[PDB]
Paper text:
In this study, we extracted extracellular fibrils from lab-cultured Bacillus amyloiquefaciens, a Gram-positive bacterium with great potential in biotechnological applications such as plant growth promotion, biocontrol, and commercial enzyme production. In this study, we use cryo-EM to identify protein fibrils surrounding lab-cultured Bacillus amyloiquefaciens and discover an unreported fibril species in addition to the flagellar fibrils. In summary, our study identified two protein fibrils outside Bacillus bacteria: the extensively studied [name] and the previously undiscovered Vpr fibrils.
The first fibril species was identified to be flagellar fibrils due to the similarities of its 2D classes and 3D map to that of Bacillus subtilis [name]. Upon structural comparison, we observed differences between Bacillus amyloiquefaciens and Bacillus subtilis [name], namely: (1) the former contains an additional D2 domain, whereas the later contains only D0 and D1 domains; (2) the later has three additional loops (L1, L2, and L3) compared to the former. These differences arise from the sequence variations between the two proteins (sequence identity 57%). Notably, these variable regions face outward from the flagellar fibrils and do not affect the assembly of [name]. In summary, our findings suggest that while the structures of [name] in Bacillus amyloiquefaciens and Bacillus subtilis are largely conservative, there are notable differences in their domain compositions that likely reflect sequence variations between the two proteins.
Author numbering:
A (entry chain A), E (entry chain W), G (entry chain B): 1 to 55
B (entry chain A), D (entry chain W), H (entry chain B): 275 to 327
C (entry chain L): 56 to 194, 198 to 274
F (entry chain Q): 56 to 164
């Protein structure tokens, strides 16, 4: 029993700050109604969209 | 040509409400599952005190 | 360990620096998008010059906002979109050379060629742009900073202060041919903004993978 | 630009509740482990009295 | 057996007043919700934050 | 006895060295997985070269991160995934020849 | 271990009587529906508002 | 001119319900976090009694 480090809790923390991030990303789409808010969601999707909107 | 392009752009850009709400709920549960197990993960080191005395 | 957990802060402080830049270019897209409707409307020949020059008022006001976003967007005390944020090195890693570079190009109206920025000389007699296009004051007709072709550039009766910049949109009011010409210039600017946005969305996607790997 | 900077400042300034509560519990146990052994550390010198008589 | 000094207990006292200090520092963050309360927690973090808040 | 209890530390110091490597390749999988979506999208012919080259920006950024993981993943002061961690001998045992070898191949782009 | 003073609890008390005050101030706005209840929330906002209401 | 001034005065004076309810909930949690840790802060001095005996 090692006390100075709780690897079980430290590992669970990373999974905690990995579903919260995904939920935050999902709620951005739900609020805005758009798949592509940032350019990192779809580079070609962002490029095609702007050409499309312009047209 | 505006309808055909508006529909074309909506598929590329707009989100599917059904397929996204269902995915949001999943990660909204996976974080509570990790939340629930994090509480127990902290309790486990607390049991060495009864051995140390 | 204390390096990877700190290099995970640097990776996330670079994610914030990059979200700010693409968040700003999110609006240069909307301004460029609106700026393209005021060239399909100005190209129609039912408009008169009294109304093409009427559209030019918003042309110069949109092009002056594209320039504002470039010179005002600032993370920490760094101007990101004014062409000075080059070779930005994020130490994503606990050792030497575990870095990532980044260079955001200048994304103002002058660079996208959807406008031009005149600056006022010391006396304020002549508005001067980079490359040096002159615009002298009270030159008689309606009063303002006239150009070498009697085309009014700025509407002012007094003299502008020192180092006051004015931004003038691309020409859509001189003719219907000119407004059509501006259409390709604007639609190309949308292309070189989309290129910059996903040059920054690509880095942000990478930095999201770098964070999971540093955390693991 | 306020959201992008508010989020940027929160990462720099705000604490992670999960990663900090888990660390607080650790030092809250390490002090009880030292507390438990301090009591025994004082008992050890008490055994020379039975030898001195 | 040396009686005038209990080095075993004297050493344990220092470790006692080293996890209590860490727990106190951890509880400051938990109560306030801020990583940087004093300027000694992050000098550059304090400097960047204030610029950020001001902005 | 003092050999088996110490050779049990070596066995566990090799478990840590191996968890680090596969922990790193856990992400080369995700990058390669994302890198495969930016080839089913680039293969469609509704894209133009202005947009295929637009996808190539993330192509080169993902492929440059796969290389980073190989050259940066380091247990102790050993680069594991750069092809230099070969013939790693763990003394799992208290005597001669009670070892296990291991060779991790180069896993960069 | 100093007993006569609990600085950890004394520090937490101040943070306790600093989020309660903020919540009370936030609930004043929510109940009334006005940003500026007192003149200390916005001096110029109070001044401009009254001119505006009068007009 | 009344609509243009009524809207002008509402922006200056009226509160944003969304941006204020979200802020109220934050401080309503930060006080419970301090409430939770205050309880533990009082328990910490209680451990010297087992050492004093």
């Amino acid at each position: 029993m090692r006390i100075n480090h709780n690897i079980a809790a430290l590992n669970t923390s990373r999974q905690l700050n990995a579903g919260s991030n995904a939920a935050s990303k999902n709620m951005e789409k739900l609020s805005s109604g758009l798949r592509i808010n940032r350019a990192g969601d779809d580079a070609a999707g962002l490029a095609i969209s702007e050409k499309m909107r312009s047209q | 040509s505006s309808e055909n392009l508006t529909s074309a752009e909506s598929r590329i850009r707009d989100v599917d409400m059904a397929s996204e709400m269902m995915e949001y709920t999943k990660n909204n549960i996976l974080t509570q599952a990790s939340q629930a197990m994090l509480a127990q993960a902290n309790q486990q080191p607390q049991q060495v005190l009864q051995l140390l005395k | 360990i204390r390096g990877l957990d700190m290099a995970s802060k640097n990776a996330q402080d670079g994610i914030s620096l990059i979200q700010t830049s693409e968040g700003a270019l999110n609006e240069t897209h909307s301004i460029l998008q609106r700026m393209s409707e005021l060239a399909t409307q100005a190209a129609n020949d039912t408009n008169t010059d009294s109304d093409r020059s009427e559209l030019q008022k918003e042309m110069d006001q949109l092009a002056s906002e594209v320039t504002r976003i470039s010179t005002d967007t600032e993370f920490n005390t760094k101007k990101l979109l004014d062409g000075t944020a080059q070779n930005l090195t994020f130490q994503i890693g606990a050792n030497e050379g575990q870095t990532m570079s980044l260079s955001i190009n200048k994304m103002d109206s002058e660079s996208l060629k959807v406008g031009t920025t005149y600056t006022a000389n010391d006396d304020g007699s002549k508005l001067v742009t980079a490359d040096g296009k002159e615009a002298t004051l009270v030159t008689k007709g309606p009063n303002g900073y006239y150009d070498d072709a009697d085309k009014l550039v700025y509407q002012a009766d007094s003299a502008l202060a020192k180092d006051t910049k004015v931004t003038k949109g691309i020409d859509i009011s001189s003719s219907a041919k000119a407004a059509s010409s501006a259409l390709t210039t604007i639609k190309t600017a949308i292309d070189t903004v989309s290129s910059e946005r996903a040059k920054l969305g690509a880095v942000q996607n990478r930095l999201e993978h770098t964070i999971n790997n540093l955390g693991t």
